[PDB]
Amino acid sequence: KLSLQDVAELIRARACQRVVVMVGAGISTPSGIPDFRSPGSGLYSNLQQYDLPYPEAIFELPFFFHNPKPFFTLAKELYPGNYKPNVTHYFLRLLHDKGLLLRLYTQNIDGLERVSGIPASKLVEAHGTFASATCTVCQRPFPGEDIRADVMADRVPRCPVCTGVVKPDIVFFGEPLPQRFLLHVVDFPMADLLLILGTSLEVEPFASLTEAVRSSVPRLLINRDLVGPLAWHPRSRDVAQLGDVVHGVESLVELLGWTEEMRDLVQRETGKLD
Amino acid sequence: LSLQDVAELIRARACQRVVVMVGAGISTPSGIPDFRSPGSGLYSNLQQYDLPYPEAIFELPFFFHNPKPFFTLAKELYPGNYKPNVTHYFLRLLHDKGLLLRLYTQNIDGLERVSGIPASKLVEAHGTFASATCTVCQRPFPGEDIRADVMADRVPRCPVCTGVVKPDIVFFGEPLPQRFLLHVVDFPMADLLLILGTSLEVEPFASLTEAVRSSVPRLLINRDLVGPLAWHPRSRDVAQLGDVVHGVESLVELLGWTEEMRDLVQRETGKLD
């Protein structure tokens, strides 16, 4: 019905001038991040010490109040600087630079989307971010940098006037989704093309947003398999770039003819990074 | 501490009371498309009815709105269509030898009974097509009774009430069968826990993996490490990771049962076809 070749030509012809992107853990794993600790991993072994009832207990608030040490152990990993953004995050940085990006809805807390240079306005961190925090008592806002010292020292931030725990802005199990998520009402009808990068779509309202786009809008699924509402309810102009995520993005960049421009971006950003 | 050691324990009847927990892992070798995957299978067929989502087939309000999608699925999995695989008969052999204590299954295919395992030895935790209950009549009916209507793309109706006759399947939100509460008795008394091809995503099912006492070893032949086995392991845990059929086959050989196994699958395939 439609191919990645056809999509590249449309972008190249500026037919899709307002792009909404939906990314998940698929794009972070090429960067080495174990966003889920399920496999055997260094981050996995440490959290078993605390004897949590189950792996998702750290995201649940009541267990945290019992013992906040496991969550901050996780935070110590994901705090910016430890891991680097990969080609995917820079492909979306290129999408922004060209003036095409409308919004980037991400399921990740790694923060690599902002690290790669994408402004917060063009970005909806749908599960939160470690870039800010609020005292669990005074409900006072603090930037990420403020608590960086304490986190990296295996300590638990206490704030200045409260001396109460300073939790970063992470959406815990039961917490309402970020205010910025409600931009889906504005963004999705106006989008002219939907990109989905490495998202299982088994969790809603994320999955539900795939049907928000107009019937003219094509939907590009570069995930390793066809998943979510795309499989149950596909559209005619949909394109499934199934396979390894980096392979799909690289092919699409080649088909767009941006590899030359792409190499420059990865270089100058790697320099600033280290 | 290793797969052979478990086999030797069973082989010597040191593990005389085995509790087994199986999932859709052991059915897919039989050809059953239980998973309702995006590729060729029922998926496209149930899309005709324009479900809101694939799991909507097992909702009570939608089924009352439109019961045709569920019965479409039923026609497929209804007994006499698919055959049991090596796993299902390996557990039948375990029963015949007097070793099986109970078989807790997450599957609705029914191949466990087809393979010869009695209903008493079985806890079909998501339901079974061995019975039905009229949604209005509230009268129980045997499985075979509705086969004609189901297999003819029709919707069965109760004889006196003429109301829909829904198989005994546990729809999303309905309480698990009373038969599930045997877990209180079985698991403390169990002598060995066998886990074959279950994701352990469902937490009421998953929680039972830790129910056995710490003396009991737990054998996980599932492809990957999941559930409380992976998250919170014990010393006596054994993980025979890899393809399910091969893992069961290796255990059968390690038990010295390969000859008796080939005998069972052959003569049982004869009875069926």
């Binding site: 998702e56 959406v171 199990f173 039961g174 917490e175 | 698990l176």
Partner: peptide, 13 residues
């Protein structure tokens, strides 16, 4: 109470 699709969800609102 079997396999309730919403096993664990971060509520949107």
């Amino acid at each position: 109470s079997p396999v309730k699709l919403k096993t664990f969800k971060x509520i949107p609102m």
